[PDB]
Design a protein around this ligand. Sequence first.
Ligand SMILES: [Mg+2]
Ligand SMILES: [Mg+2]
Ligand SMILES: [Mg+2]
Ligand SMILES: [Mg+2]
Ligand SMILES: [Mg+2]
Ligand SMILES: [Mg+2]
Ligand SMILES: [Mg+2]
Ligand SMILES: [Mg+2]
Ligand SMILES: [Mg+2]
Ligand SMILES: [Mg+2]
Ligand SMILES: [Mg+2]
Ligand SMILES: [Mg+2]
Ligand SMILES: [Mg+2]
Ligand SMILES: [Mg+2]
Ligand SMILES: [Mg+2]
Ligand SMILES: [Mg+2]
Ligand SMILES: [Mg+2]
Ligand SMILES: [Mg+2]
Ligand SMILES: [Mg+2]
Ligand SMILES: [Mg+2]
Ligand SMILES: [Mg+2]
Ligand SMILES: [Mg+2]
Ligand SMILES: [Mg+2]
Ligand SMILES: [Mg+2]
Ligand SMILES: [Mg+2]
Ligand SMILES: [Mg+2]
Ligand SMILES: [Mg+2]
Ligand SMILES: [Mg+2]
Ligand SMILES: [Mg+2]
Ligand SMILES: [Mg+2]
Ligand SMILES: [Mg+2]
Ligand SMILES: [Mg+2]
Ligand SMILES: [Mg+2]
Ligand SMILES: [Mg+2]
Ligand SMILES: [Mg+2]
Ligand SMILES: [Mg+2]
Ligand SMILES: [Mg+2]
Ligand SMILES: [Mg+2]
Ligand SMILES: [Mg+2]
Ligand SMILES: [Mg+2]
Ligand SMILES: [Mg+2]
Ligand SMILES: [Mg+2]
Ligand SMILES: [Mg+2]
Ligand SMILES: [Mg+2]
Ligand SMILES: [Mg+2]
Ligand SMILES: [Mg+2]
Ligand SMILES: [Mg+2]
Ligand SMILES: [Mg+2]
Ligand SMILES: [Mg+2]
Ligand SMILES: [Mg+2]
Ligand SMILES: [Mg+2]
Ligand SMILES: [Mg+2]
Ligand SMILES: [Mg+2]
Ligand SMILES: [Mg+2]
Ligand SMILES: [Mg+2]
Ligand SMILES: [Mg+2]
Ligand SMILES: [Mg+2]
Ligand SMILES: [Mg+2]
Ligand SMILES: [Mg+2]
Ligand SMILES: [Mg+2]
Ligand SMILES: [Mg+2]
Ligand SMILES: [Mg+2]
Ligand SMILES: [Mg+2]
Lengths: 50, 247, 91, 77, 63, 112
Amino acid sequence: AAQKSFRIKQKMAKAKKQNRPLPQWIRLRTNNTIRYNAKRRNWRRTKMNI
Amino acid sequence: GRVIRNQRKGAGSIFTSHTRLRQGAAKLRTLDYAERHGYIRGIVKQIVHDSGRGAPLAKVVFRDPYKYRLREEIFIANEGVHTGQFIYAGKKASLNVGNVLPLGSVPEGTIVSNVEEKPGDRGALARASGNYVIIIGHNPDENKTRVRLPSGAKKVISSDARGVIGVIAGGGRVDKPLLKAGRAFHKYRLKRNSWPKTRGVAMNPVDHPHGGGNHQHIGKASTISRGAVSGQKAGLIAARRTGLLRG
Amino acid sequence: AKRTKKVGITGKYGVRYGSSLRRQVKKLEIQQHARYDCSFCGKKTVKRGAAGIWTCSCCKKTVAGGAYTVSTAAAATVRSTIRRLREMVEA
Amino acid sequence: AREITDIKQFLELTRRADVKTATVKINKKLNKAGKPFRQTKFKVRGSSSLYTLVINDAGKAKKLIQSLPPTLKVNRL
Amino acid sequence: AHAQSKREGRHSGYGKRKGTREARLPSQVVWIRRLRVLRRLLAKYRDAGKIDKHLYHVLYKES
Amino acid sequence: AQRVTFRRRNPYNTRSNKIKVVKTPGGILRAQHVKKLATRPKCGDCGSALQGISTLRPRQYATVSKTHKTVSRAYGGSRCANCVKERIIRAFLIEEQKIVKKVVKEQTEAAK
RNA sequence: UCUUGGUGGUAGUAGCAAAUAUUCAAAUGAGAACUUUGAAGACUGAAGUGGGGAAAGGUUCCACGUCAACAGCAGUUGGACGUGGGUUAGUCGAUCCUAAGAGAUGGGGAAGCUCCGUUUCAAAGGCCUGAUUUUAUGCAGGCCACCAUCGAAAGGGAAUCCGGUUAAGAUUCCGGAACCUGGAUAUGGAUUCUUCACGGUAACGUAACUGAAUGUGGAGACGUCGGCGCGAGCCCUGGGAGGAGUUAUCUUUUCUUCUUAACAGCUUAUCACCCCGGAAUUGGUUUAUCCGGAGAUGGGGUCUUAUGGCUGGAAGAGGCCAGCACCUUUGCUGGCUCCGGUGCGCUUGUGACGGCCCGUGAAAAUCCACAGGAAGGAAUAGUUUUCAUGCCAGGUCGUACUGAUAACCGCAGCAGGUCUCCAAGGUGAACAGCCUCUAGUUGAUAGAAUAAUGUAGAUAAGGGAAGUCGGCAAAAUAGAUCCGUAACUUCGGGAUAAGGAUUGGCUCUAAGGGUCGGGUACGAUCAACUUAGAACUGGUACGGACAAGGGGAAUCUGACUGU
RNA sequence: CUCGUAGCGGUUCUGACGUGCAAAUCGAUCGUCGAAUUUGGGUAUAGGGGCGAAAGACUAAUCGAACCAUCUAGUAGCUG
Ligand SMILES: [Mg+2]
Ligand SMILES: [Mg+2]
Ligand SMILES: [Mg+2]
Ligand SMILES: [Mg+2]
Ligand SMILES: [Mg+2]
Ligand SMILES: [Mg+2]
Ligand SMILES: [Mg+2]
Ligand SMILES: [Mg+2]
Ligand SMILES: [Mg+2]
Ligand SMILES: [Mg+2]
Ligand SMILES: [Mg+2]
Ligand SMILES: [Mg+2]
Ligand SMILES: [Mg+2]
Ligand SMILES: [Mg+2]
Ligand SMILES: [Mg+2]
Ligand SMILES: [Mg+2]
Ligand SMILES: [Mg+2]
Ligand SMILES: [Mg+2]
Ligand SMILES: [Mg+2]
Ligand SMILES: [Mg+2]
Ligand SMILES: [Mg+2]
Ligand SMILES: [Mg+2]
Ligand SMILES: [Mg+2]
Ligand SMILES: [Mg+2]
Ligand SMILES: [Mg+2]
Ligand SMILES: [Mg+2]
Ligand SMILES: [Mg+2]
Ligand SMILES: [Mg+2]
Ligand SMILES: [Mg+2]
Ligand SMILES: [Mg+2]
Ligand SMILES: [Mg+2]
Ligand SMILES: [Mg+2]
Ligand SMILES: [Mg+2]
Ligand SMILES: [Mg+2]
Ligand SMILES: [Mg+2]
Ligand SMILES: [Mg+2]
Ligand SMILES: [Mg+2]
Ligand SMILES: [Mg+2]
Ligand SMILES: [Mg+2]
Ligand SMILES: [Mg+2]
Ligand SMILES: [Mg+2]
Ligand SMILES: [Mg+2]
Ligand SMILES: [Mg+2]
Ligand SMILES: [Mg+2]
Ligand SMILES: [Mg+2]
Ligand SMILES: [Mg+2]
Ligand SMILES: [Mg+2]
Ligand SMILES: [Mg+2]
Ligand SMILES: [Mg+2]
Ligand SMILES: [Mg+2]
Ligand SMILES: [Mg+2]
Ligand SMILES: [Mg+2]
Ligand SMILES: [Mg+2]
Ligand SMILES: [Mg+2]
Ligand SMILES: [Mg+2]
Ligand SMILES: [Mg+2]
Ligand SMILES: [Mg+2]
Ligand SMILES: [Mg+2]
Ligand SMILES: [Mg+2]
Ligand SMILES: [Mg+2]
Ligand SMILES: [Mg+2]
Ligand SMILES: [Mg+2]
Ligand SMILES: [Mg+2]
């Protein structure tokens, strides 16, 4: 809202650092079943509700 | 099967007094040794307008007897009181318009206003615009005085109760017609949310005991007992006689 | 000229509100908008200042009054009655 | 940015120990017939203010530029 | 070029006015100019001295 | 004509958000935020503007000196030199009345 | 019409048709209706498809790489995908204040979750000592009667502007120039043997010019409408100094640059006030009729500084050019940047007024002043300095971007909805419609063809409501000037009633202003668009597009505006 | 008060659309347009309650009684 609380920007900061794909070396690990980030979020596809 | 508008007013949510712009509580000066054995001299400094009140307010300034400071009391202005006028409150005071004296120490037929119902409750009788109180009697042993109230009733008050000489200013106000719903709108804008009024016969039966039917008609007698409750007291409450006054 | 025969100040209300009610307001709008003669300075400079309030434009002195006229007939009687009762008390 | 209209307060100002620099400006105020002269401004860097002394007479502009202290740093243009 | 034609008095006929006479030029502004002219003249004639202060007060209320 | 913008995050035409379009040394027009206009100090008796005193916003009066805030009389920046003169007359004429009302009262009770 | 999942026919069907519109060439590329550049055509047309913001979003901003999925065609493009970069504040907000309100405590209720109440029936408490050597300043006087706290990113409020800078930040960075608050503190000045200033008749003036408790006053602090005055910015325009366009012909021409911030000093005012004077033959005076023996007119003054002018800031910056260098580090040098006019213009701010109300149109923090005289203090400057200068510090959080025919909500890249600022020329009464400038966009699956039936827009001979439940839809009327205008009426209206004429272009005519002046029978000068009239002229056209009332006679019904 | 923009509503075409652009839009034609106006933010009133210039209207596409969970696999002489 361009004049945020810090508590809003801190959760906004967290969401950007989570906004990445899976690291590719994790898919090479032993007994690994993770194929992709199932918790990926977009600003266009899902609003994160404060 | 729904609570009616006359019941909903007691919850006091949207039905309160619109009291932002009002100048204060229009009371008398607190009854003390100055006003019980001699007098005290005030001074009008403003005749101001009170929001939602049809009567002007006189700001009368006194000196505090015990501390060096000025105490500003707010009076209802009497018709004839001006700015710059010395105002006397007490027992030994002189009868002029705007002076405050006990009811016992003013003669029969004196015209008073802002009259205490009990000695020292700072003004209860004759406070609307134009109204006044006439002293019609005295019982000096067991000090009381007989008055005529603005309704025409007869009341017996202590002779230590106070009053201000004169009528309350602003009289003749209701004699002017409002002419339109707009001037009713701004009168009640600064009082409280009682306006407008929907007729109960113009309703549905769930909302009012008068509503419903294929024609707008009351159905039962509009006169209801005093011994009824909320939801049934929608009409003429405890009426003695109805209709015009033609005998 | 003489623009209206009878409505006068009440021509702002048009044809509305009834002719009785326009006549009823007319005598009080003339009464509330007139300049009145001051009792202190003597000049005709008293106008209404939110009903019951009558400030004189010169001498800056405000008189509590009636709603539409400076003194009501009812409070004229009070000035006669209280003056009589003041003399017969201090007689 | 105060404007100084006097020589003796200007010299008293240039030894104030908060002033360390100054700038001198040459303006070429060529008008039609009144005065097409060579204006010279003496701006003084005080701590809270910049003091300008304008000298339109080009004689006194040569006189004041000599009498400045040597602990002050002068900027031409 | 149209502005010069307007100055010379063209394109101002009855077929070129869409507004009323008051919308095009308010009668109050006509009065304000014309009263201020007569009051300028009256003060100029009194103060220079070609009318006295008595003929002035007659014409001022007639203006 | 070049058009301007509010230079603060308030986009509303409130009392605290008034602008004056001004031209810069960069040749462009820009909004300039105008402070509130000050009110003259009114008289403590008649409530008229009292002269010789600066017209500043109420916290600016702590910055200026005492000369801007007071006239050289009694009741200087309080009252308005006609209310003061009336105050001196009204002071004087009452103790001379009180002295007269004392010797009138004392003499008339000394008789009977 | 079971449940969950999967799959068909319909079917390569319906459809992908609102928002005027695209086209040529080159470049890139595997591939171009869609990308990029150039050219062209167009549109939004300043109440914008333009520049910013509030809520909301949250990285969408910007760069590089990329095109599997997504952009209902395509795609080399992207608000997509991958990797990164990006948000700088003493001065802008939050923070502080109170509003409507919310809400602890004391206390009462309720089995209890908890409810009431916000000053109450409470033993509800901090503030400075005049000023320091028995002071961690109290182990002392002395003062104060209220009583949490939350509540506004539109209300109140200490103080920052210009220029430049980025791929993306900016009233935050950089450069220059200020200011405020808090603290400490020296010097100069001021005042002082009259110990706490002097001048003026006064209004009041000044660089200063002690002031405790306490009290009082002011500011913060206020409606709306109207007209008038003044200012800023814009618009219009003259002369000149450049640059660009057109140039068969005409055009001393058309477009364009010619700027000055916060802050500071000096001046600058309607209103208000002071002195002299004493007014009827009443005078002054506003657009608007108020004022004057409670002292007008008049002659002298005083004050507020809205606001304007000068100067500093500041021409050194910004703009427009020119010349020469011409992977020149990358520029270097030089010139100009000047003087006006106009106004029922537009937007805005303000001032003095007037109108309106049974409506008279917040509060507090905060800051100052006065009254009072507590205390302390005089040598060649004792104190005190709200005078000038000098020193130090200014925390935390926010800041990017969109703000919507793609960044918000509506399942979504939905013709919907969602608060606000700025606002160019012409036509015209106009912020209307229509066209253009600045800026912006040219996005919406396309191509070909021109069947029916549609949808949207038209026109129609003669008739003119015969249609239909019903003139539904459409047509007709329409601006302005002048004429004329009924019944009825609550006397205000009806009413633009009804009706009827005129309207273009050109060339003229006539009114209607401002500044300049007298002797101890006078016209230079400039400027504005209204109105009236005339002639001439024409395929009798002329409110030439646009814009824009159909009207009348009756009855019912609700008085009316409003919901 | 009136004509009429912006605005705010929603008369008529019973127009378009009616597997829409849209679970209420689009277009024309309209009402009204300086106040009983329109509107943002803050705040208050809460389900048998509120609120209602009154239509059983509105109270998150839900209203002659909101929504959520539980009692609850409520009961069914009725249909599959
Ligand atoms: Mg936080
Ligand atoms: Mg009713
Ligand atoms: Mg009903
Ligand atoms: Mg006009
Ligand atoms: Mg007129
Ligand atoms: Mg604010
Ligand atoms: Mg299935
Ligand atoms: Mg299928
Ligand atoms: Mg097909
Ligand atoms: Mg097709
Ligand atoms: Mg168009
Ligand atoms: Mg166009
Ligand atoms: Mg890219
Ligand atoms: Mg596709
Ligand atoms: Mg593809
Ligand atoms: Mg982008
Ligand atoms: Mg990315
Ligand atoms: Mg601030
Ligand atoms: Mg607090
Ligand atoms: Mg707070
Ligand atoms: Mg306010
Ligand atoms: Mg800048
Ligand atoms: Mg930016
Ligand atoms: Mg800086
Ligand atoms: Mg000294
Ligand atoms: Mg001195
Ligand atoms: Mg003050
Ligand atoms: Mg600044
Ligand atoms: Mg005079
Ligand atoms: Mg505006
Ligand atoms: Mg100082
Ligand atoms: Mg930023
Ligand atoms: Mg920004
Ligand atoms: Mg932005
Ligand atoms: Mg949702
Ligand atoms: Mg799409
Ligand atoms: Mg225009
Ligand atoms: Mg015009
Ligand atoms: Mg299209
Ligand atoms: Mg036909
Ligand atoms: Mg025909
Ligand atoms: Mg028929
Ligand atoms: Mg038939
Ligand atoms: Mg029709
Ligand atoms: Mg006409
Ligand atoms: Mg007609
Ligand atoms: Mg008729
Ligand atoms: Mg009706
Ligand atoms: Mg009815
Ligand atoms: Mg009736
Ligand atoms: Mg109606
Ligand atoms: Mg109307
Ligand atoms: Mg109307
Ligand atoms: Mg409209
Ligand atoms: Mg409908
Ligand atoms: Mg339909
Ligand atoms: Mg679809
Ligand atoms: Mg209207
Ligand atoms: Mg809006
Ligand atoms: Mg109930
Ligand atoms: Mg019903
Ligand atoms: Mg439910
Ligand atoms: Mg069941």
